[PDB]
Design a protein around this ligand. Structure first.
Ligand code: LQT
Ligand code: MN
Length: 298
């Protein structure tokens, strides 16, 4: 029948004392959040970093996503370049035309149920566009940085030096890496995957409509992979996991019916989402938004 939402993942609202060091804070919430595989962190209300990207120079070519492509089992889609403004106008027009109502009036539960119906629907073909893996080096980070390429107002300095600035997260693993940008739209999505080297990942939503997340704890990772390889198409069964997780999209209720724990959440503007080592995660955007993510080491 209709989609059944997984239980909600933990939300943390640290005080200013607990918000000092991200690594220490993440270490303290670990015994809980590691059981859900993902968690949400709302910074104190007075923490409000400005958006540091250069908007007039921001240009990208998003990738075409067909929601039902796996159910359908190369001239279909014509790819186009956007600015931030022109993408937002296209994104907002798509959502309001699809649901026949203003974009901010569409309930998050309604986009969720419709997304998973469209994923499995062979009767309807919905095409969206996903701003994807845009390096922060070209346009600059969404956070103010001290690199000296622009700005840094006096009010901006504390955010450029903040440990919660994603450019300041430690990227280096001990042995004998820059943030990435995502311009989202309804329904654009990321499928089930883990980070390289089972790394942590932290994700910040600068502005826009929410990003919906699903996540699985690391102790269930093998269970997810077994259900995946069981129900995945045969041609992709023998593919290595690095190539497999490009196409692996599965209704969370299907995982839950096989006993795999799955947790959900809606990441709104100004909120962090942390994924723990080897925690499988997936999701989709509710609408036009801008997100920044980096893999970090502890
Ligand atoms: C740290 C960013 N990155 C690139 C690093 N790779 C070079 C390893 C990733 O793969 C992260 N995984 C993709 C992803 C996207 C989104 C999104 N579109 O909001 C949410 C969660 N995960
Ligand atoms: Mn990820």
């Amino acid at each position: 029948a209709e989609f059944v939402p997984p239980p909600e993942c933990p939300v943390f609202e640290p005080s200013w004392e607990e918000f000092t060091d991200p690594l220490s804070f993440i270490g303290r919430i670990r015994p809980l959040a590691e059981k859900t595989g993902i968690c949400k962190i709302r910074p104190p209300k007075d923490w409000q970093p400005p958006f540091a990207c250069e908007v007039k120079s921001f240009r990208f070519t998003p990738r075409v996503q067909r929601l039902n492509e796996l159910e359908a089992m190369g001239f279909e889609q014509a790819v186009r370049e956007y600015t931030l403004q022109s993408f937002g106008e296209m994104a907002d027009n798509f959502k309001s035309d699809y649901f026949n109502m203003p974009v901010h009036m569409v309930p998050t539960e309604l986009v969720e149920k419709e997304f998973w119906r469209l994923v499995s629907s062979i009767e309807e073909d919905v095409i969206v566009e996903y701003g994807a893996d845009i390096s922060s080096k070209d346009f600059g980070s969404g956070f103010p940085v001290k690199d000296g390429r622009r700005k840094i107002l006096p009010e901006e300095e504390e955010y450029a030096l903040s440990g919660w600035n994603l450019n300041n997260m430690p990227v280096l693993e001990q042995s004998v890496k820059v943030p990435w940008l995502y311009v989202g739209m309804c329904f654009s999505s990321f499928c089930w995957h883990i980070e390289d080297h089972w790394s942590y990942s932290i994700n910040y939503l600068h502005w826009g409509e929410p990003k919906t997340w699903y996540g699985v704890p690391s102790h269930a990772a093998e269970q997810l992979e077994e259900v995946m390889r069981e129900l995945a198409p045969e041609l992709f069964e023998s593919q290595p996991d690095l190539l497999h997780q490009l196409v692996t999209i599965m209704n969370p209720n299907v995982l839950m019916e096989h006993g795999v724990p799955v947790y959900r959440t809606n990441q709104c503007a100004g909120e962090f989402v942390v994924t723990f080592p080897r925690a499988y995660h997936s999701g989709f955007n509710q609408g036009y938004n801008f997100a920044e993510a980096v893999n970090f080491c502890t």
